[PDB]
Design a protein around this ligand. Structure first.
Ligand SMILES: O[C@@H]1[C@@H](O)[C@@H](O)OC[C@H]1O
Ligand SMILES: O[C@@H]1[C@@H](O)[C@H](O)OC[C@H]1O
Ligand SMILES: [Ca+2]
Length: 223
């Protein structure tokens, strides 16, 4: 997160860190046994880390649970990042409490102009590199489809939306991938891609979760 603020320990209780020896992506807890993330975050050997603030210090609210199964969206295209979503099932159910909690799936899509909360442990510099240890937050609006398409000609699908600031300086970034965009208490986006970070006229591009609720639900019901 570039241009954001320190969330505060466990104030984003659905935020998960995906760990393969080190933090490499975010995700979102959607019930006691399932995490949603970006398909481009797929790898083997994932441990899901819940209840994290400082990802380099054991502070007392963590739950570390290995993945038992990963399901990349059937139509994920890694070249275009269309359908950049995946589901991860935990080997055991997380213990849900105030600091570790699921986030509701949307019942409708969010409109341009809605303010959302984006969070992650990604890079905090736009020309440079500094990875934070504690969770960073950014409040950002969804941008219009037309400004999104004009920013990224030929690249925005119906499964993507832009959010952030065309002036630059505030964005998600490398290492935030897979994490949440939450708008009015609903998971509307997954951190997916962008040109650099926090660059002028290059806002963040997000997986449009509302398109995937039926696939998420039926997948969960049968796995
Ligand atoms: O976003 C672009 C994608 O849609 C494709 O065209 O490959 C190149 C990327 O930069
Ligand atoms: O009990 C585990 C503990 O050892 C670790 O520190 O945090 C995750 C828990 O699952
Ligand atoms: Ca920790």
């Amino acid at each position: 997160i570039v241009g954001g603020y320190t969330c505060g320990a466990n104030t984003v209780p659905y935020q998960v860190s995906l760990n393969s020896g080190y933090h490499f992506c975010g995700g979102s807890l959607i019930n006691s046994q399932w995490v949603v993330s970006a398909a481009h975050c797929y790898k083997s050997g994932i441990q899901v880390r819940l209840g994290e603030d400082n990802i380099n210090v054991v502070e007392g609210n963590e739950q570390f649970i290995s993945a038992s199964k990963s399901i990349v969206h059937p139509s994920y295209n890694s070249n275009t990042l269309n359908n950049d979503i995946m589901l991860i099932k935990l080997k055991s159910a997380a213990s849900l409490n105030s600091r570790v909690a699921s986030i509701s799936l949307p019942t409708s899509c969010a409109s341009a102009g809605t303010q959302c909360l984006i969070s992650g442990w990604g890079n905090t510099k736009s020309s440079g590199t500094s990875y934070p240890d504690v969770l960073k937050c950014l409040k950002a609006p969804i941008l219009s489809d037309s400004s999104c398409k004009s920013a990224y000609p030929g690249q925005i699908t119906s499964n993507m939306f832009c959010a952030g600031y065309l002036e630059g300086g505030k964005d998600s970034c490398q290492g935030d991938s897979g994490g949440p965009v939450v708008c009015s208490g609903k998971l509307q986006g997954i951190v997916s891609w962008g040109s650099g970070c926090a660059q002028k006229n290059k806002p963040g591009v997000y997986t449009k979760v509302c398109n995937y609720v039926s696939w998420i639900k039926q997948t969960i019901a049968s796995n």
